[PDB]
Amino acid sequence: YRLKAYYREGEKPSALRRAGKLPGVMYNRHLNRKVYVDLVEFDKVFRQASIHHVIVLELPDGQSLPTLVRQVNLDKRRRRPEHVDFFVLSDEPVEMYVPLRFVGTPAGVRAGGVLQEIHRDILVKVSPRNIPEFIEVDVSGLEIGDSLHASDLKLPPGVELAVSPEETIAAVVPPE
Amino acid sequence: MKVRASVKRICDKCKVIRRHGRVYVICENPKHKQRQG
Amino acid sequence: XXXXXXXXXXXXXXXXXXXXXXXXXXXXXXXXXXXXXXXXXXXXXXXXXXXXXXXXXXXXXXXXXXXXXXXXXXXXXXXXXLXXXXXXXXXXXXXXXXXXXXXXXXXXXXXXXXXXXXXXXXXXXXXXXX
Amino acid sequence: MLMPRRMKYRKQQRGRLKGATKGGDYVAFGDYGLVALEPAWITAQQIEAARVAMVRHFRRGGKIFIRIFPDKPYTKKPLEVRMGKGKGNVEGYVAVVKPGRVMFEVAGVTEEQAMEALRIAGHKLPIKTKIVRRDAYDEAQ
RNA sequence: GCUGACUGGGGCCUGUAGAGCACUGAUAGGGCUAGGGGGCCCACCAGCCUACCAAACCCUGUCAAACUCCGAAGGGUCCCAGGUGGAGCCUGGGAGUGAGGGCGCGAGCGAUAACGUCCGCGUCCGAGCGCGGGAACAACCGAGACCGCCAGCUAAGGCCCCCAAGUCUGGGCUAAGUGGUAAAGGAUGUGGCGCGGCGAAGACAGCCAGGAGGUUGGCUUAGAAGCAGCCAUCCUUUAAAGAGUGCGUAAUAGCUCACUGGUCGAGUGGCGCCGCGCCGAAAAUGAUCGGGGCUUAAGCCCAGCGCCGAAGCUGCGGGUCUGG
RNA sequence: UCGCCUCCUAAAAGGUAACGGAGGCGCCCAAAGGUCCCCUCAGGCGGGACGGAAAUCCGCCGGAGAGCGCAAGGGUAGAAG
RNA sequence: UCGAUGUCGGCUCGUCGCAUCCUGGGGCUGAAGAAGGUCCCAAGGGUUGGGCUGUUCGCCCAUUAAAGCGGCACGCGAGCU
C-alpha cells in the first residue's frame, strides 16, 4: 500500500496531466506542499485502497509519509481523476471513513429480496495507527420493513466514530 | 434474417466473416445469412 | 498452474507411498478392460492397488522432486503407473502380469518398474509375475 | 406518466446546452450503471420508455433508480398555425442532461444482467451512453 | 487648445456564465413520527400497539429566465497618467438617412427548422461588384486601389500537368478513389496501446484412446436415465467424468462432451483505450474531387529548408491635399 | 391590441425587440396624514371549555418567513409596522 | 418575378428516376409438389376497354402476365380543347 510522489514545484498543472503524470497535494496542520504522482501507478492503487486504507508515500526524499485521501476532484465529463489530495497522518485521533461490509444472507430474499446499502462506509474517529478495516454488520434478521442503522453495530475497542446515530445504514426495497 | 443495417451473431455457430468488401455472417442453418445493406 | 500443483503434488505421496509401482503404456483399450484390470487388482488389495494411467510429462518431475533417477527409461509416451500400497507386492504384479497376457497382448507393452526402490528391467515384469 | 404536480410558470423559454454537468457525475446509490455522453433533452416518455424495458429484461429482479427528472415544459405550436401570435402551449416534458450525467443505476442485479439491461435501456435513448460500476465515486474520505 | 478613441493604476457601482439549496417553488428513493381507523378495555376514556393510508422532521440525491447564503471573468464611471489624430469641445449655414443584409458570438419566437425572424456586442457588404485567394460567387481568408515601371519581398491560398512556384527532405497511418464531405448502430478491416488466463512439470490448434457410479431417485389427473419440469444442492469404481453446452431420441440405445492419458511439442485464446478506414446509404436531361489524373500519393498525420503569389509593402519617377 | 405600474427576457453599469413569457391601474385614506410619547412578529413544540389544521390564552425555542389598502417587486422591527 | 413567369382536367407527344407491377435471377421459409409468403439483383421491354363524375383520385363492370409509385413549372394553352 505505497506511492512515490514527485515534488510539484509549480509548473503548469495542465502540463502534468497533459503529460502522463497525475498532480495532487498532501498536507495537514503543519504542511501543504503541491505534489504529483503518475496517473496509472495511481489507479491500480486506488482501486484497492481508494480511501479506506492508508497510503504511505516516499517521494525523492526516502520519506515514507502515512496518508489517505480527503478527496479527489474528478472530471465531471469523460470521468477520470483530475487533482488529488493527501492527509499527512499524525498520532492524533482523526476523521476517517471506515469501509462497511454487511454479512449473512438477507431474510427478505426468498420473499421479495433486493438489499439497499445506503452508505457502506463511515465517519469514524481514531488513532490512524489503529484503524480496523472492514466492520462486521448483519442481516440474520433483516426484513423489508425498516432496517438497522446508527449504532446497532460493533465498535472495535478504541473506535468511537461520529454518525448521529441516525442515518439509516441500509435496507431492502421491493423487486419488480 | 438476410439484409439489414445491423448485422450480428444470432446463435453460436454463426461466424462473422467478411468478404467482397462487406461484413458477412454464415452459420449452420441458413436462417442467419446476414449481409450489411 | 493451479491444480497442476494439485495433481503433480498428488502424484508423489503415492510415489513415495508404495512397494510395487509400475507404469507401462496402454493403447487400444475399450471401456471394459479398464474396470477389469482394477476389478482384478483390488480384491487382493482393496482400495490401494488401483489402475493409474497417470501423466508422462508429470513424471519427469513427479519423480525428480522427492529426488530420483534411473527413471529416464519407462514412460516416454502414453505411460501409466501401477502403484501398490497394501497387500504383499505379489498379488497386484501377478494380477498385473496376466492383465496384458490374457486378451492377446504382446508381453512387451510395459515399461519396467520401481517396486520397492531399485530400478527394474524387461525380464523382471515376467520375473515377479511367475 | 411523469412530471411535476406543480409549477411557478407553465411556459418556459427553452435556452441552450453548454458543457459540464454541474452534478450527478458519480454513483451514490446502485451497483452498476449508465451515463450520458452527448448533451440533450430527454423526453419523459423516453425516460419511462426505457424505465420499463429495464424492469422488463429483469422480471422481478433488482431495484431501479432514475436519478434524472424531467420538469422543463416541451413547447409545440398547433399543427400548421403560422408565426408570431403568442407561444404554443405545453406538449410534454424534458430533462436537460449535460454529459457525464449519470441517469440511472440498478443494484443487486447480477452484473451480467445489470449490464445487459443498461444496454437496451439505452437503446430507447437518443444519444450514446456509458456503462459503469463503482470506482472513483467515493466522496466519503 | 491635450480634453478624444484606445491604454495603466487607483476607489467604488452590479447580481449575468457558474454553481448552490440558505429564501420561493419543482424533486427520485430512505428513515422518522405529531396523528387516525383498530384491538385488549372498562371508562372522567388511561394504556398496550399496529406485517394501513400520512401530515411535517432530517437524510441521500439533483432543478430554476422571472430562486440566490454565494458570485468571477468582463463592462461602466471618476481621479492621476500616457495618447498631435481627418481626436476631441464649441457656435452657426446645409445635408441626406429614417425599407436594411450577410457572418460570429449572447438570447427570445420557431421544431436547439428556414439565404426566417426579432433585440445585444463586434465585423464586413452597403457605398470596398477595384484586386488576390475561395472552381465560378456583396458580404468566408488577404488586404484600404492618386497615376506610371518589361523591378523586389510576402499575406491568404498554393508548389504534377491545364496553371507561377519542391514529382523536395525526414519519420508514422491509410488500401476505401476513403480523401473528393450524412447518423444511430452494427462487424475475427487494419495501426499503436491495456489488464487478466496459462504453458518447454510441452498448454489452444493436432489425432488413435477413456465419457464410469449412486442411476433410471421422488411430488404427477401420462414417466424423468445428463436428455421437458423444483427442492437438497454431494458421494462411489477414478488418467478423467455430472444427476452434462448440445448435434443427437418419446422414455432410450448413440455420433460426441465439459473433466483427461498424450503422440505433437511453440507461444496462445475471450475482453477495455486512440488513429484511421468499411456497411448503414434510394430520385427524377449527362457525368464529375473545377478538370486530367493520383496508392512509401498529387492523401492523411508531426516535423524542416526554400520559393511561387496582391492593386498590401518596398525602389523610382510624376500628380495631389491639408500642416510646419 | 392601442396610455400606465411590477418581474423576467435584457448577455453584472443605463437602456434595449416581437400578435415574447406572467400580473395589475383608471381607485383609496380627515386618518390609512404632521408629530411626540409608548409597543413587537411568523411560525414550530409543549400546555390549554367551546376549541380545524392557525381564534383568544399560557411557556419556552424562533430576528423577520407577519404586517404595510391594493399588483409584483425594492425596501423595512435600530420601524415604514 | 405584379411596365404579367396564364392557375384544374383532358387530348397529344414524350423523357426520366428504382423505392419493381409484370417478365428474368437468387436465399431463406412455419419451402414436400403445387401455390405463396418476406428479402436481394435487376427498368431491357411491357404496364388494357369501358360506366359516373369537370374531376386528378376514387368506386364498379370485362379482361390481364400485369393492370405499378413519382419528376419533368403537381410536364406539356406561341400545341388543342
PDB file of N, CA and C in Angstrom, chain A residues 51-54 68 70 94-99 122-126 131-132, chain D residues 141:
ATOM      1  N   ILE A  51      -9.643   4.829  -0.280  1.00  0.00           N
ATOM      2  CA  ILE A  51      -9.694   5.720   0.880  1.00  0.00           C
ATOM      3  C   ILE A  51     -10.130   5.014   2.163  1.00  0.00           C
ATOM      4  N   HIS A  52      -9.977   3.700   2.252  1.00  0.00           N
ATOM      5  CA  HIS A  52     -10.407   3.012   3.469  1.00  0.00           C
ATOM      6  C   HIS A  52      -9.204   2.375   4.149  1.00  0.00           C
ATOM      7  N   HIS A  53      -8.061   2.532   3.495  1.00  0.00           N
ATOM      8  CA  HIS A  53      -6.790   2.024   3.982  1.00  0.00           C
ATOM      9  C   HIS A  53      -5.836   3.213   4.063  1.00  0.00           C
ATOM     10  N   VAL A  54      -4.559   2.967   4.324  1.00  0.00           N
ATOM     11  CA  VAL A  54      -3.639   4.086   4.413  1.00  0.00           C
ATOM     12  C   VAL A  54      -2.487   4.017   3.423  1.00  0.00           C
ATOM     13  N   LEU A  68      -3.965   9.243   3.370  1.00  0.00           N
ATOM     14  CA  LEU A  68      -5.232   8.745   2.861  1.00  0.00           C
ATOM     15  C   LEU A  68      -6.094   9.944   2.469  1.00  0.00           C
ATOM     16  N   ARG A  70      -8.494  12.999   1.208  1.00  0.00           N
ATOM     17  CA  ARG A  70      -9.501  13.815   1.852  1.00  0.00           C
ATOM     18  C   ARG A  70     -10.508  14.058   0.769  1.00  0.00           C
ATOM     19  N   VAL A  94      -8.066  10.863  14.301  1.00  0.00           N
ATOM     20  CA  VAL A  94      -8.527  11.508  13.072  1.00  0.00           C
ATOM     21  C   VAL A  94      -9.811  10.965  12.389  1.00  0.00           C
ATOM     22  N   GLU A  95     -10.460  11.880  11.667  1.00  0.00           N
ATOM     23  CA  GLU A  95     -11.703  11.689  10.918  1.00  0.00           C
ATOM     24  C   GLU A  95     -11.612  10.824   9.643  1.00  0.00           C
ATOM     25  N   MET A  96     -11.626   9.501   9.768  1.00  0.00           N
ATOM     26  CA  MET A  96     -11.574   8.689   8.556  1.00  0.00           C
ATOM     27  C   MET A  96     -12.823   7.820   8.445  1.00  0.00           C
ATOM     28  N   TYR A  97     -13.204   7.503   7.205  1.00  0.00           N
ATOM     29  CA  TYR A  97     -14.396   6.691   6.929  1.00  0.00           C
ATOM     30  C   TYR A  97     -14.156   5.191   6.813  1.00  0.00           C
ATOM     31  N   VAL A  98     -14.641   4.500   7.823  1.00  0.00           N
ATOM     32  CA  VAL A  98     -14.491   3.083   7.842  1.00  0.00           C
ATOM     33  C   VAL A  98     -15.346   2.401   6.815  1.00  0.00           C
ATOM     34  N   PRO A  99     -14.722   1.535   6.027  1.00  0.00           N
ATOM     35  CA  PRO A  99     -15.305   0.724   4.964  1.00  0.00           C
ATOM     36  C   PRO A  99     -16.302  -0.247   5.611  1.00  0.00           C
ATOM     37  N   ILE A 122     -18.028   4.937   6.674  1.00  0.00           N
ATOM     38  CA  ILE A 122     -18.426   5.792   7.825  1.00  0.00           C
ATOM     39  C   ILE A 122     -17.411   6.645   8.611  1.00  0.00           C
ATOM     40  N   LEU A 123     -17.842   7.882   8.898  1.00  0.00           N
ATOM     41  CA  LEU A 123     -17.115   8.927   9.644  1.00  0.00           C
ATOM     42  C   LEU A 123     -16.672   8.490  11.047  1.00  0.00           C
ATOM     43  N   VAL A 124     -15.628   7.666  11.120  1.00  0.00           N
ATOM     44  CA  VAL A 124     -15.126   7.161  12.400  1.00  0.00           C
ATOM     45  C   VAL A 124     -13.818   7.846  12.841  1.00  0.00           C
ATOM     46  N   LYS A 125     -13.754   8.290  14.095  1.00  0.00           N
ATOM     47  CA  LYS A 125     -12.529   8.927  14.582  1.00  0.00           C
ATOM     48  C   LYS A 125     -11.690   7.834  15.208  1.00  0.00           C
ATOM     49  N   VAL A 126     -10.374   8.010  15.142  1.00  0.00           N
ATOM     50  CA  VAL A 126      -9.451   7.038  15.697  1.00  0.00           C
ATOM     51  C   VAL A 126      -7.978   7.362  15.438  1.00  0.00           C
ATOM     52  N   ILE A 131      -6.496   1.381  12.952  1.00  0.00           N
ATOM     53  CA  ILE A 131      -7.653   1.585  12.071  1.00  0.00           C
ATOM     54  C   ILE A 131      -8.213   0.247  11.606  1.00  0.00           C
ATOM     55  N   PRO A 132      -9.176  -0.342  12.336  1.00  0.00           N
ATOM     56  CA  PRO A 132      -9.649  -1.619  11.791  1.00  0.00           C
ATOM     57  C   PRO A 132      -9.996  -1.377  10.319  1.00  0.00           C
TER      58      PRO A 132
ATOM     59  N   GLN D 141     -14.307   9.580   2.459  1.00  0.00           N
ATOM     60  CA  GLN D 141     -12.983  10.030   2.960  1.00  0.00           C
ATOM     61  C   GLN D 141     -11.850   9.030   2.662  1.00  0.00           C
TER      62      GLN D 141
END
